[PDB]
Design a protein around this ligand. Structure first.
Ligand SMILES: NC(=[NH2+])NCCC[C@H](N)C(=O)O
Ligand SMILES: O=C(O)CCCC(=O)C(=O)O
Ligand SMILES: [Mn+2]
Length: 349
């Protein structure tokens, strides 16, 4: 239950030490489902400033917080009890930060689902979150180069999918437990390549390590949602709050691309006796990228990442104005169109 902690090099070049580190990261994910990375003073400072901005925002009146929403992007506020996981409400309040695109961006003009501007509460919160996410992204890129090297793949295998990647962050406050219900967030897996997470001192995150012989749902398939799976079955590892680290675990895309050599780590949050702040960062493919099986070149299966993101956020927030506008304007049909008639040059000739 004692997690490994690694210091990452600032730049990953493919030298023997980098390859060795990648092997160790893979082995830690395969054993524990998670590891820690040590933060330097700037990484820590930016983490703490984000947490502080989160605490200040959550003290604002509910009507103000609820105004920070968009019918174009899922960025913005989620009230306690608003998100659904496995048919049951989750109880953190959240501020989601997706790619911040104004109505001047061609993708927004074209009505691409989920594309639009973050409804920032104020410009100091904006600066704190953007600074933090730029640091988190540098770490995500290092981790992806290391992971490629550990699997004996070209160093750019995963970073070639994350140019202009759909990176996003959930800035969370869990209330203290006030009723008989201890569920903070139900068991689930996240959707992209990596999850990098930070937490305060309170405690409440649990993760499920790989279990020999245990079948894992492929959450990218509509018939194999991972939400709720294993909720009440051991083993669950408590992620002990530890100063000076971020945690890292794989998301759905890494499970798919590695054919299950890595598993998207199931995790859940239990409410504690005090309110708890955390941030979860998602290092994702480009919205237009298609993930593919790395070890089965003849396999026809693919995951269109933006389609997976969109499907997931629609199931998280079935009644949100963003979802209503996707349904009203049939923006899922435009997602089918953009697969073949996009102008961004993110994919294709
Ligand atoms: N947007 C998220 N990453 N939410 C994480 C919780 C699980 C999510 N409600 C789901 O049903 O898949
Ligand atoms: O609470 C934490 O430690 C962060 C992880 C919570 C989570 O699963 C998510 O937001 O996707
Ligand atoms: Mn999660």
């Amino acid at each position: 239950t004692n997690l490994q902690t690694f210091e990452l090099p600032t730049e990953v070049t493919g030298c023997a030490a980098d390859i060795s580190l990648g092997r160790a990261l893979i082995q830690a994910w395969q054993k524990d489902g998670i590891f820690q990375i040590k933060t330097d003073s700037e990484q820590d400072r930016k983490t703490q400033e984000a947490m502080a901005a989160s605490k200040q925002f959550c003290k604002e009146p509910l009507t103000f917080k609820s105004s920070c929403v968009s019918d174009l992007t899922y960025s913005g506020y989620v009230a306690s009890g608003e998100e659904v996981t496995a048919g049951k409400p989750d109880f953190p309040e959240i501020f989601t930060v997706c790619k911040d695109l104004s109505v001047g961006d061609q993708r927004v003009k074209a009505g691409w689902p989920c594309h639009g501007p973050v409804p920032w509460p104020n410009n100091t919160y904006q600066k704190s979150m953007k600074t933090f996410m730029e640091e988190l992204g540098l770490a995500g890129e290092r981790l992806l180069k290391l992971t490629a090297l550990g699997f004996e793949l070209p160093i750019n295998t995963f970073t070639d999918l994350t140019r202009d990647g759909w990176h996003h962050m959930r800035v969370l406050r869990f209330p203290p437990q006030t009723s008989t219900l201890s569920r903070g967030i139900g068991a689930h897996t996240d959707y992209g390549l990596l999850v990098i997470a930070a937490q305060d001192d309170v405690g409440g995150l649990y993760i499920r390590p790989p279990v020999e012989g245990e079948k894992r749902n492929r959450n990218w398939l509509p018939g194999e949602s991972s939400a709720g799976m294993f909720e009440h079955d051991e083993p669950w590892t408590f992620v002990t709050p530890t100063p000076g680290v971020w945690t890292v675990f794989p998301g759905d895309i890494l499970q798919f691309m590695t054919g299950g050599q890595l598993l998207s780590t199931p995790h859940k949050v239990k409410l504690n006796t005090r309110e708890r702040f955390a941030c979860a960062y998602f290092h994702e493919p480009n919205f237009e990228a298609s993930a593919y099986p790395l070890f089965e070149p003849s396999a026809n299966e693919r995951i269109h990442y933006g389609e997976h993101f969109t499907n997931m956020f629609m199931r998280c927030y079935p009644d949100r104005i963003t979802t209503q506008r996707i349904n009203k304007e049939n923006r899922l049909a435009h997602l089918e169109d953009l697969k073949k008639y996009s102008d961004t040059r993110a994919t294709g000739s």
